[PDB]
Amino acid sequence: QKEFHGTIDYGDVTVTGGISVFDAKFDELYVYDGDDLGAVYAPEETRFRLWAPTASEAFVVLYETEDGMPVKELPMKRDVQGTWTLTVAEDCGGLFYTYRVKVGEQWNEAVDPYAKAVGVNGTKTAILDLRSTNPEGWENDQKPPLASPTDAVIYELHVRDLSIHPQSGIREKGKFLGLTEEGTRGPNGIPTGLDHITGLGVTHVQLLPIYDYSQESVDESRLDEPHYNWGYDPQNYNVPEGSYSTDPHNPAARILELKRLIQKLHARGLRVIMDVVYNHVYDGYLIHFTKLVPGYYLRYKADRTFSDGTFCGNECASERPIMRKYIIESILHWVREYHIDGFRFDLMGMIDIETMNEIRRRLDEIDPTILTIGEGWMMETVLPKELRANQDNAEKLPGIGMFNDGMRDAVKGDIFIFDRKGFISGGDGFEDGVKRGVAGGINYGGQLRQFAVEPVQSVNYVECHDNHTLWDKIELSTPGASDEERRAMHRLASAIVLTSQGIPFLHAGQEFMRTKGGVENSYKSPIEVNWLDWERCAAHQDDVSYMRSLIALRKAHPAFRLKTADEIRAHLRFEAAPPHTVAFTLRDHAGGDPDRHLYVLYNANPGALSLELPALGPWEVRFGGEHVLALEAGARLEVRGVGVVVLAVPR
Numbered sequence: 001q002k003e004f005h006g007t008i009d010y011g012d013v014t015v016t017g018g019i020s021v022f023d024a025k026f027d028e029l030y031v032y033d034g035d036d037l038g039a040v041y042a043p044e045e046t047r048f049r050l051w052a053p054t055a056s057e058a059f060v061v062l063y064e065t066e067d068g069m070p071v072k073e074l075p076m077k078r079d080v081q082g083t084w085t086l087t088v089a090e091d092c093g094g095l096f097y098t099y100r101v102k103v104g105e106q107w108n109e110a111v112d113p114y115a116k117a118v119g120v121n122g123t124k125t126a127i128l129d130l131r132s133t134n135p136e137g138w139e140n141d142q143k144p145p146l147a148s149p150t151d152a153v154i155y156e157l158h159v160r161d162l163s164i165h166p167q168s169g170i171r172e173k174g175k176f177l178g179l180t181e182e183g184t185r186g187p188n189g190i191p192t193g194l195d196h197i198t199g200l201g202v203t204h205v206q207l208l209p210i211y212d213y214s215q216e217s218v219d220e221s222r223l224d225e226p227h228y229n230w231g232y233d234p235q236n237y238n239v240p241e242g243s244y245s246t247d248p249h250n251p252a253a254r255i256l257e258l259k260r261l262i263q264k265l266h267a268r269g270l271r272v273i274m275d276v277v278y279n280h281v282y283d284g285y286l287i288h289f290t291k292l293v294p295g296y297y298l299r300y301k302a303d304r305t306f307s308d309g310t311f312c313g314n315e316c317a318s319e320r321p322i323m324r325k326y327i328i329e330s331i332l333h334w335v336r337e338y339h340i341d342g343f344r345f346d347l348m349g350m351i352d353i354e355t356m357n358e359i360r361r362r363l364d365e366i367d368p369t370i371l372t373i374g375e376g377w378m379m380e381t382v383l384p385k386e387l388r389a390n391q392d393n394a395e396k397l398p399g400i401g402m403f404n405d406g407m408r409d410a411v412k413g414d415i416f417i418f419d420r421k422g423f424i425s426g427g428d429g430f431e432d433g434v435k436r437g438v439a440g441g442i443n444y445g446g447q448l449r450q451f452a453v454e455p456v457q458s459v460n461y462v463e464c465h466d467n468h469t470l471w472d473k474i475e476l477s478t479p480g481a482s483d484e485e486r487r488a489m490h491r492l493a494s495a496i497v498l499t500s501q502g503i504p505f506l507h508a509g510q511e512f513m514r515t516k517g518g519v520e521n522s523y524k525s526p527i528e529v530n531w532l533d534w535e536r537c538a539a540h541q542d543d544v545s546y547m548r549s550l551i552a553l554r555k556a557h558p559a560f561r562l563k564t565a566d567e568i569r570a571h572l573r574f575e576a577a578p579p580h581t582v583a584f585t586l587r588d589h590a591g592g593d594p595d596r597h598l599y600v601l602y603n604a605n606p607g608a609l610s611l612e613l614p615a616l617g618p619w620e621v622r623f624g625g626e627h628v629l630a631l632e633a634g635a636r637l638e639v640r641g642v643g644v645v646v647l648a649v650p651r
């Protein structure tokens, strides 16, 4: 992130037999396989293990307070496969620690990469009995059922956005605990917070970064002054973010309160997906990895400069054995310690395929219903192309979902050309792009094919935290339209997401046409840009009810949720349809649907049309009757107006 006022020393190579940390032969040395990296606290002793093969000396530095002076500095013993060990024979509860190493001529001090608790702003590791952080009844925590990734409805949310608006009616504004408060009310008495979210019928809340991110993003010691950040600046991967706790200065508070949040979501029928950012760290020069083992954990070009394919300054070297181990053990920590139900991998194309498949394999051993989705964008890096976990390699990543950007841009228009129209806004030639997404991105037939082998690999969305909101994109691409016409386009885009095969994904506030005032990239914009505006929600309760009704329609019809590509190819049929419309049927009780056949019309044409319907039986209106002038029994549909219509032939 910043200019480093200092030196990186890559080591005295005599320590490693003349083999440099950059050499390809280095990877086969020092591959520790134990499960005890970090510190293990017991009442009579704490055991430390540090992986630092290039260091000539290593110490545990003990502190009594989070901002105090060292009270003890103990040398560690060189142990197996590049590690250092130390047992401190005292009760270390309540203490803090760092490691100090000598690498080359430099002495460096760093937080434990395997930290499970930290002091304020994450500058020291906190020693802690994590069992003391478990909520009452945590042992009885039970997940809501989930039969298929296609049965999930994901709701993407930032912990600060949720509650920081002054009329949210939530007491612990901006905190994990704000999402545990039930019966909260907003303007005109509307439900807000948790009750609003459960009322929508979504199944998964995907939380923007809840791991500990950098002080430059949010200073945890100055929370009495304005602050906001998405948090894509990782500092401590295995501990929660301090600013979402009621007391950033109490190491246990953030841990207990996140567990209480997850417990409450599960009890209210919601699963939790964690946004994880293993592709980069906040600052490649200052991160603990670089202080402890410089040159290993991050990717370097041949000329020994950082590979910067993330556009964040650095990339994590996920393909090197000890970093692969780190990432896997981190994910398993969040699953085992925090009962997390899924992961969304930021810039997944920066992670190697072997690592991603091992993650998916290890999670399947625990619970196959844990979700794994990610940004599988094709992006350049020093990591060879055939190893990148992106769309081009999706056939090598079974069971991992990827955001379907092809569908996104077909529906609402190019996200990088703000004024360019798409299907909903009357652009020409987007119908096949919408059809490709309807089919869940699979190889459906003809030119209707995308990257997915199976529909569980395709996450459908028209809004997320990145880029303009759907409302703001519609505004920029429809300068000649009225706001009433724009609201109809907005509703159509949401209907396309929720009636397409694959995994539907909604951005928090999409239900009330969330706006950021035209801000394209709001990662550090103030709360007035980023909050969930509960006043707008109160003015848009009909639109909220429409989203709720779309979610209910998808739940009522398993034909929208087919689990396999073979079923989609057997049951989904596209019908002849005029420009600026798409029409399809889901035939023969698809996926166990109660109705014999469904017909779905996506109508982006504002005028009156008479459409031919397939002769499959006595059609009746199930959704979108506000657009239907008549249903003629040679069957025909008389429609007017932009929106979705769903018909059914009953059993």
Ligand SMILES: OC[C@H]1O[C@@H]2O[C@H]3[C@H](O)[C@@H](O)[C@@H](O[C@H]4[C@H](O)[C@@H](O)[C@@H](O[C@H]5[C@H](O)[C@@H](O)[C@@H](O[C@H]6[C@H](O)[C@@H](O)[C@@H](O[C@H]7[C@H](O)[C@@H](O)[C@@H](O[C@H]8[C@H](O)[C@@H](O)[C@@H](O[C@H]1[C@H](O)[C@H]2O)O[C@@H]8CO)O[C@@H]7CO)O[C@@H]6CO)O[C@@H]5CO)O[C@@H]4CO)O[C@@H]3CO
Pocket: 045, 075, 076, 077, 086, 087, 088, 089
């Ligand atoms: O003197 C040789 C020795 O020097 C160095 O060790 C120093 C170390 O670096 C310092 O940190 C400190 O050690 C203190 C330690 O950190 C504290 O934790 C505590 O140690 C207690 C242990 O925590 C506790 O578990 C128990 O220890 C018992 C062992 O668990 C048990 O296995 C057995 O130990 C026997 C060994 O298994 C056996 O191999 C053999 O040990 C020899 C080592 O293999 C050999 O390398 C060398 O050790 C070096 C060491 O590598 C340096 O880092 O010689 C050892 C033989 O003397 O024999 C062991 C049996 O004696 O039994 C032990 C004892 O019950 O209890 C201890 C507390 O007793 O306190 C430590 C200091 O009090 O200082 C040491 C140097 O003083």
Ligand SMILES: OC[C@H]1O[C@@H]2O[C@H]3[C@H](O)[C@@H](O)[C@@H](O[C@H]4[C@H](O)[C@@H](O)[C@@H](O[C@H]5[C@H](O)[C@@H](O)[C@@H](O[C@H]6[C@H](O)[C@@H](O)[C@@H](O[C@H]7[C@H](O)[C@@H](O)[C@@H](O[C@H]8[C@H](O)[C@@H](O)[C@@H](O[C@H]1[C@H](O)[C@H]2O)O[C@@H]8CO)O[C@@H]7CO)O[C@@H]6CO)O[C@@H]5CO)O[C@@H]4CO)O[C@@H]3CO
Pocket: 311, 377, 378, 379, 405, 409, 414, 415, 416, 417, 466, 467, 521
């Ligand atoms: O450069 C830093 C960059 O970081 C952030 O971008 C993130 C972005 O917000 C996320 O959405 C995602 O991006 C991925 C995207 O979602 C995927 O779809 C795919 O992108 C492909 C497009 O789908 C595809 O259409 C095509 O894109 C072409 C454009 O349509 C075309 O317009 C042109 O793009 C030019 C832009 O019009 C022009 O503005 C300029 O772009 C600059 C941006 O203006 C500037 O803000 C910044 O971008 C940020 C971004 O704001 C962050 O949010 O730098 C840009 C410098 O170029 O120039 C463009 C010239 O290329 O051409 C493109 C390419 O032909 O192909 C793309 C590529 O596959 O993958 C995206 C990730 O690569 O993640 C990113 C990264 O975090």
Ligand SMILES: OC[C@H]1O[C@@H]2O[C@H]3[C@H](O)[C@@H](O)[C@@H](O[C@H]4[C@H](O)[C@@H](O)[C@@H](O[C@H]5[C@H](O)[C@@H](O)[C@@H](O[C@H]6[C@H](O)[C@@H](O)[C@@H](O[C@H]7[C@H](O)[C@@H](O)[C@@H](O[C@H]8[C@H](O)[C@@H](O)[C@@H](O[C@H]1[C@H](O)[C@H]2O)O[C@@H]8CO)O[C@@H]7CO)O[C@@H]6CO)O[C@@H]5CO)O[C@@H]4CO)O[C@@H]3CO
Pocket: 542, 543, 545, 546, 548, 549, 550, 621, 622, 623, 624, 625, 626
């Ligand atoms: O409460 C939210 C709602 O409030 C306002 O609507 C009022 C409306 O303006 C008044 O006219 C009156 O409504 C009565 C109506 O006049 C009567 O005709 C009857 O309605 C029956 C229908 O005639 C009958 O066809 C059937 O309706 C079915 C539809 O045909 C079928 O399409 C589907 O309906 C779904 C919608 O298509 C879909 O859009 C979505 O509806 C949501 C709206 O989009 C959203 O704006 C909001 O609606 C507001 C509305 O804008 C206000 O003007 O919430 C809606 C519900 O989520 O989802 C629908 C459900 O799937 O299915 C329906 C039902 O099977 O039956 C109905 C009822 O018997 O009675 C109406 C009174 O109940 O008053 C309403 C407010 O009460």
Ligand SMILES: [Ca+2]
Pocket: 121, 122, 212, 213, 214, 215, 218, 220, 235, 241, 242, 243
């Ligand atoms: Ca932090």
Ligand SMILES: [Ca+2]
Pocket: 368, 398, 399
């Ligand atoms: Ca699977």
Ligand SMILES: [Cl-]
Pocket: 173, 174, 175, 223, 243, 244
């Ligand atoms: Cl805060």
Ligand SMILES: [Cl-]
Pocket: 377, 378, 379, 380, 385, 388, 390, 392
């Ligand atoms: Cl690529």
